[PDB]
């Protein structure tokens, strides 16, 4: 059963095993069961850890339900794949990726006075091809002041760095004037409309190029896994795979009583139903209850 904080996370979720846990919970509440009071407890560090591990139970069956657009031509399979992961972010409680990674910046650098310590605590989230181009330009503005460039904004020594880092950001290809004019806004709704149409033209060309770089790495991983496997004789392949299949079954049979190992071996019985339901009618496929 679910712990009533999982089932609040699975309401806007749309995978199968989470909706049938919701639907049997809503069928219990139709038969007069009391909805248990959700906890007004679990302080700021424990609340961010439950949100970390309940979002990952919405993301994990959702990622396995998104077909990769491997070996497709065009942007719309890559835009479908990116839109399904956007919607998986919203179903799991994430915001927009722009609003969720900039929250990661301002959280990791809450205590930063100099921008060299910004550029070292946001190292995991910024590309090293871009972290280096902001560190080389930093040491030139460090050469003009011969004092550490501050994370102040009011400082004029930062204002000449922010005009040099804007020259770096346009060199990568990303419009730093359009990005800044979106998250700041404007007064009228007509001049803010044209900059949102120009941010979302960058943003869609941004997240497509992250999805397409993810597809081009799965395509390159699968093509090197296959070409290594096609160089084996077929007798080696069948026993390398039967050794890997049997070792991975035994790890789920060593684990007794665990919920994951009970569900692992129950899905092995559901794959063998799929192979057996196809053998009865192969022009029809698997037989669904209809």
């Amino acid at each position: 059963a679910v712990s009533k904080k999982e089932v609040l996370y699975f309401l806007s979720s749309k995978d199968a095993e989470s909706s049938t846990a919701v639907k049997s919970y809503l069928k219990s509440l139709y038969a007069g069961a009391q909805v248990e009071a959700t906890e007004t407890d679990a302080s700021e560090l424990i609340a961010q850890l439950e949100k970390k591990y309940l979002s990952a139970q919405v993301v994990e069956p959702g990622v396995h339900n998104i077909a990769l657009p491997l070996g497709e031509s065009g942007s719309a399979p890559v835009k479908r794949y990116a839109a399904e992961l956007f919607n998986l972010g919203a179903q799991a409680g994430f915001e927009c990726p722009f609003i969720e990674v900039s929250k990661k910046f301002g959280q990791e650098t809450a205590t930063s006075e100099t921008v060299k310590d910004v550029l070292n605590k946001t190292k995991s989230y910024v590309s090293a091809d871009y972290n280096a181009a902001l560190n080389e330009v930093l040491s030139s503005v460090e050469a003009e002041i011969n004092g550490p460039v501050l994370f102040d904004g009011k400082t004029e020594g930062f204002k000449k760095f922010a005009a040099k880092a804007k020259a770096v950001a346009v060199s990568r290809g990303l419009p730093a004037d359009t990005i800044l004019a979106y998250c700041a806004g404007s007064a009228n709704e007509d001049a803010a409309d044209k900059v949102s149409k120009e941010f979302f033209t960058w943003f869609e060309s941004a997240y497509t190029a992250d999805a397409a770089a993810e597809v081009k790495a799965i395509e390159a991983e699968a093509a090197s896994i296959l070409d290594r496997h096609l160089a084996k004789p077929v007798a080696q392949i069948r026993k390398e795979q039967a050794s890997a299949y049997a070792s991975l079954l035994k790890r789920a049979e060593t684990a007794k009583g665990a919920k994951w190992a009970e569900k692992y071996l129950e899905d092995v019985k559901a794959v063998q139903w799929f192979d057996a339901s196809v053998a009865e009618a192969p022009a029809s496929g698997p037989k669904v209850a209809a």
Binding site: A16, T20, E50, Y53, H64, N65, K259, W260, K287, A290
Partner: protein, 40 residues
């Protein structure tokens, strides 16, 4: 036997979801007993 369902057949099979649940069922109740008992 035959003809399972549709909502039984829409489940992704070898996802984690239950290692993530088994970890959070043994990390969240084990860390509430860390902040309630914490002095440096």
């Amino acid at each position: 036997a035959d003809a399972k369902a549709l909502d039984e057949l829409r489940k992704p099979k070898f996802s984690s979801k239950y290692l993530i649940q088994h970890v959070s069922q043994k990390l969240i109740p084990a860390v509430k007993e860390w902040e309630k008992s914490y002095q440096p």
